[PDB]
Amino acid sequence: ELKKESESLRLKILVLRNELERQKKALGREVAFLHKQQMALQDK
Amino acid sequence: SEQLQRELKELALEEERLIQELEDVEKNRKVVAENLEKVQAEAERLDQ
């Protein structure tokens, strides 16, 4: 049943997009924190 | 019916690309954690 298979994939996609955004935002924070610590070590 | 079959194939490729992208972000987060721990381990050495 396509209409169901289509809807299933659309919902899976919506959830993945939201998940990808949250993880990208986490990575962004983690990179900035790593860089801060790397530079702190460089600087002192 | 044809269109909707072509549609289904394109949605699967998009779903797969999002899954791959999430995988790749996790790969990145893992490296960042590993490198953070090495920097912290060295900082702790110096602070003693």
- Cα–Cα distances in angstroms (integers) from residue A26 to residues A3, B19, B26, B40, B43, in the given order: 35, 17, 10, 19, 23
Residue A7 to residue A29: CA distance in whole angstroms: 34
Chain A residue with minimal CA distance to B43?
A41
Four-CA torsion A31, A36, A40, A43, nearest 10 degrees: 100
| 3-class DSSP string for A1-43 | CHHHHHHHHHHHHHHHHHHHHHHHHHHHHHHHHHHHHHHHHHH
- In chain B, domain spans: 1-48
Residue A37 to residue A31: CA distance in whole angstroms: 10
User: Is B41 touching A (CB cutoff 8 A)?
Assistant: no
Using the CB atoms, write b or e for A16-27: b if 16+ within 10 Å. Answer: beeebeebeeee
Chain B residue with minimal CA distance to A31?
B32
Resolution in A: 1.9
Which residues fall within 8 angstroms of residue A30, CB to CB, at 6 or more apart?
Answer: B29, B32, B33, B36
